[PDB]
Amino acid sequence: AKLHDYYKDEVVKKLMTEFNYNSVMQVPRVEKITLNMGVGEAIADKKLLDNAAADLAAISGQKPLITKARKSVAGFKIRQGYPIGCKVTLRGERMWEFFERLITIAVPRIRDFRGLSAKSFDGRGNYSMGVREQIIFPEIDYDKVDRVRGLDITITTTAKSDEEGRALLAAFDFPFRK
Amino acid sequence: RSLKKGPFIDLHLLKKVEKAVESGDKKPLRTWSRRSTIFPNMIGLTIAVHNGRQHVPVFVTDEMVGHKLGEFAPTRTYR
Amino acid sequence: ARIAGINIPDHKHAVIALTSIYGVGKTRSKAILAAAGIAEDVKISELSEGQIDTLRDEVAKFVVEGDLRREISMSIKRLMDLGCYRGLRHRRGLPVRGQRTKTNARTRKGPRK
Amino acid sequence: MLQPKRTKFRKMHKGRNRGLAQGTDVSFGSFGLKAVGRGRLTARQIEAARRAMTRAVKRQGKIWIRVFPDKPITEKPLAVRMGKGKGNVEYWVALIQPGKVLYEMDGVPEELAREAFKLAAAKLPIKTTFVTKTVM
Amino acid sequence: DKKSARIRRATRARRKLQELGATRLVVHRTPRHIYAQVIAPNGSEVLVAASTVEKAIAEQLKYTGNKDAAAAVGKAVAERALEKGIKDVSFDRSGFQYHGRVQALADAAREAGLQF
RNA sequence: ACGACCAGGGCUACACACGUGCUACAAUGGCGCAUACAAAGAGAAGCGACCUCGCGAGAGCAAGCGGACCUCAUAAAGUGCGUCGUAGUCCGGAUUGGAGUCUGCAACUCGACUCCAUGAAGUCGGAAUCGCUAGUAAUCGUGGAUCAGAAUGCCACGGUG
RNA sequence: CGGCACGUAGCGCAGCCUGGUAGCGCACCGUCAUGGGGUGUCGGGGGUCGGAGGUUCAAAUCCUCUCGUGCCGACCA
RNA sequence: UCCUCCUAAAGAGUAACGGAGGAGCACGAAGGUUGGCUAAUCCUGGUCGGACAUCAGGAGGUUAGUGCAAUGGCAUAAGCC
């Protein structure tokens, strides 16, 4: 409940004076995150799939839900059936430990990070980020080495500009390009 | 490749500097001397180093005096 | 730790596995060991509670990792911007050592085709 | 020559004229030809027409050409007994009606414009009549 | 949108019943309130109704919507239907699933011996 | 003047092909310690000990010797141990980057050497073809000349065999 | 002209039927012999599939628009 | 032979060696029910991830989706789980 508290404490206060309104439950809060690792292919991704799964399970304390193809497949082919990604939607619980594992076990643990990007925008101003190559964690899957290291990380905060999206995520510090 | 620790300043640039401590750019400096490594006062100039055929002006930067200035003129061309 | 750069290998001598620390190599290994006053007869497997400090400390004194891999590759474009020999030779793939491109240079041109 | 590049359909019917117009006004032009009478442009008529205009108005003014031909219209070939299949598209006709604006000049005096259009016309298949720009 | 989803889930029932022609039991849930009203045979007026907001209601309630608000509307279903003697209730679920308070006040009309 | 003289370039391109060599693909081994024995040549615009300093190449200081005297010279594989364990690695060293050294006035295309890093391809080579009958082959060094300064070349000498 | 079959590496057929890969023959080109060639041992490369894209994850194929080319018929009087 | 649309003149049904296309089935779920769910397209951002896999949001409002032709019809959704 680390980041959880922080919110209800002095995140809200800080942002308040930045960005005064007539309202204070308007405030932009992080909604559920997603951790997607899209395994891809289907030639052998039913064995490859299990590894990719267990790794999302390294982070989250729950297993993920594989996603079957949506609308169209290009030169990858293989139908509108076929599971081909793995993604999981994250609890508040799962959220605050991940936020102390984003910065406590994901920036002390790095290939290299001089930031990534100043800004990100999704139409209401959310910040989505690739790690590019995934960071170690408790796992025995560094031993084995995982087919696809990196995942994506969308925050799905409820906002209206990235001009507050950043500030929100700067409160405990996600540093980015500085 | 190396310059030792005796890089050639060159004398045929020396003359240029004395005709360039009262004038900035006024010409593309007809300088046949390649083995130079020029003083800052001459940096920011179009030093026209000779490349075995005709000269070519070189808009020197500080990182083109880490090394000879000859090197920053091709003396053959490939296609 | 596993420190800067993921993995430190084990099931082998301390000096060895230290050579696998992306910018540390043959000398540079035994040089940290000499520093940190510790043996190589022992493996890294054993990871001393002393050696654990000096891991990050001595690799922090050297240009290594992202830091080095930045600077070098920043400088391949540096010269390139100035019409240097060293410069353009990188975008033809060519050497800078006066090597045989009449015959050889099959690490610069890639192999025989 | 001129036809749908991606055809909606290959063949189409005779069609009928019911005459009149609604397309009666220059919108790029300032002078123009409207129709009197009804018929078809086989588009070799549009082509001949675009040509004759250009040679006259020169590189002054600009030309637009309302109606693009959209009804195929078949011709069943020679020396075969008729009614055995529908024919093949030998044409692209442009069903035209009275008061239907053909072409459109601009940029040149009222007189030049007439005596460029008078020159085009006759390579047109019906009687024409002049358009003035009109405030509306 | 919660109000939106609700609406489309309810317009099913409010078309199958409407054809048959019944005195229906509409149940509206709300996290803190209950509305529940007994609409006309054809649907044109409400004959009798209850909610949490009656004071007649409120007395045996700790707080509004606590499901002693559906045990007080087990009483109200029992009390209001059978004043007008009605027992022709057909449960109009209103896109709510038959769980919690939904489940209640409608099992308590089975305790009132209304016809289902 | 296709003469003549100089500065720069080009002789060491390159998208390729071929020939003659060198170094590996490994534990008959590699790296680390210490340790075992040589032969034949070279030299005052020379080789250069010593001692000092340099991680080093080497530089500074300078003895000695134009020489079976002294300097090059410490032979290296080898050996006894230390290890690594058959992994593209602790193998291998290409590439490049940076840092430096030396000969020169000056190493830009076209110098070698060292230092640290980077760390290549390659896990013994189809078709084919050649060398070599003994101190040879094989492999391992050593020395010379040309050398201001660039030897996997040539030329010579021995080790094991 | 119309019917109906097929153009597929330099060149000629498979694969199409029952959507996919695109193979194979010899030639081209390189290695290797041989003094050199030819030959050949032997290594690699070569097809918008005749043009075209609608169906569809997938079109040389199936279907439709279409080009010449080959083949069958323009006959009874 | 059968189905769809147009021709077919706004009832109907309808000719041609008229204009277009399908079918000669499939399924035990793709049926039934009950409960739930809501596209296409493009924009933006986000490891591998390519213009387009997957994730998120935005715009958009069925331009989709209907086991399989075309039309009519489908958000109460018949669709989709």
UniProtKB/Swiss-Prot annotation, chain B:
InterPro entries per the UniProt record, alphabetical: Ribosomal_uS19 (IPR002222), Ribosomal_uS19_bac-type (IPR005732), Ribosomal_uS19_CS (IPR020934), Ribosomal_uS19_SF (IPR023575)
Annotated GO biological process: cytoplasmic translation; ribosomal small subunit assembly
Membership in a protein family: Belongs to the universal ribosomal protein uS19 family.
Encoding gene, per UniProt annotation: rpsS
Quaternary state and interactors: Part of the 30S ribosomal subunit. Binds S13 and L5 and cross-links to the A site tRNA.
Keyword Repeat assigned: no
Protein name: Small ribosomal subunit protein uS19
Keywords: Ribonucleoprotein, Ribosomal protein, RNA-binding, rRNA-binding, tRNA-binding
Organism: Escherichia coli (strain K12)
Record GO terms (molecular function): rRNA binding; structural constituent of ribosome; tRNA binding
Function: In the E.coli 70S ribosome in the initiation state it has been modeled to contact the 23S rRNA of the 50S subunit forming part of bridge B1a; this bridge is broken in the model with bound EF-G. The 23S rRNA contact site in bridge B1a is modeled to differ in different ribosomal states, contacting alternately S13 or S19. In the 3.5 angstroms resolved ribosome structures the contacts between L5, S13 and S19 bridge B1b are different, confirming the dynamic nature of this interaction. Bridge B1a is not visible in the crystallized ribosomes due to 23S rRNA disorder. Protein S19 forms a complex with S13 that binds strongly to the 16S ribosomal RNA. Contacts the A site tRNA.
NCBIfam families registered for this protein in UniProt: rpsS_bact
Curated annotation (Swiss-Prot), chain C:
HAMAP family assigned to the protein according to its UniProt record, in alphabetical order: Ribosomal_uS13
Region (Disordered) residue spans: 93-113
Task of the protein: Located at the top of the head of the 30S subunit, it contacts several helices of the 16S rRNA.
Family, per entry: Belongs to the universal ribosomal protein uS13 family.
Organism: Escherichia coli (strain K12)
Record key words, sorted: Ribonucleoprotein, Ribosomal protein, RNA-binding, rRNA-binding, tRNA-binding
GO MF annotation, one: rRNA binding
Pfam assignment, any one: Ribosomal_S13
Effect of N104H: In PW095; partially suppresses a rimM deletion
Name of protein: Small ribosomal subunit protein uS13
The encoding gene: rpsM
Subunit details: Part of the 30S ribosomal subunit. Forms a loose heterodimer with protein S19. Cross-links to the P site tRNA and weakly to the A site tRNA. Forms two bridges to the 50S subunit in the 70S ribosome, contacting the 16S rRNA and proteins S19 and L5.
UniProtKB/Swiss-Prot annotation, chain D:
Gene Ontology terms: cellular component: cytoplasm; cytosolic large ribosomal subunit
Keyword Ribosomal protein: yes
CDD domains recorded: Ribosomal_L16_L10e
Annotated GO MF terms: rRNA binding; structural constituent of ribosome; tRNA binding
GO biological process: cytoplasmic translation; ribosomal large subunit assembly
Record keywords, A-Z: Hydroxylation, Methylation, Ribonucleoprotein, Ribosomal protein, RNA-binding, rRNA-binding, tRNA-binding
Tagged with keyword Plastid: no
Residue list for modification (3R)-3-hydroxyarginine: R81
Modified residues (N-methylmethionine): M1
Parts forming coiled coils: none
Post-translational modification: Is hydroxylated on Arg-81 by RoxA. The modification is nearly suppressed when E.coli is grown in anoxia.
Pfam families associated with the record: Ribosomal_L16 (PF00252)
Function statement: Binds directly to 23S ribosomal RNA and is located at the A site of the peptidyltransferase center. It contacts the A and P site tRNAs. One of the last ribosomal proteins to be assembled in the 50S subunit. The simultaneous presence of uL16 and bL36 probably triggers ObgE's GTPase activity and eventual dissociation from the mature 50S ribosmal subunit. It has an essential role in subunit assembly.
PANTHER family per UniProt: 50S/60S RIBOSOMAL PROTEIN L16 (PTHR12220), LARGE RIBOSOMAL SUBUNIT PROTEIN UL16M (PTHR12220:SF13)
Entry similarity comment: Belongs to the universal ribosomal protein uL16 family.
NCBIfam families reported for this sequence: rplP_bact
Subunit comment: Part of the 50S ribosomal subunit. Cross-links to the A and P site tRNAs. Interacts with assembly factor DarP(YjgA).
Record protein name field: Large ribosomal subunit protein uL16
Primary gene name: rplP
UniProtKB/Swiss-Prot annotation, chain E:
Pfam families: Ribosomal_L18p
NAD found in the keyword field: no
InterPro entries for the chain: Ribosomal_uL18_bac-type, Ribosomal_uL18_bac/euk
Molecular function GO labels: 5S rRNA binding; structural constituent of ribosome
Region (Required for binding of the 5S rRNA/L5/L18 complex to the 23S rRNA) residue spans: 1-16
Keyword RNA-binding: yes
Name of the featured protein: Large ribosomal subunit protein uL18
Native source organism of the sequence: Escherichia coli (strain K12)
Gene behind this protein: rplR
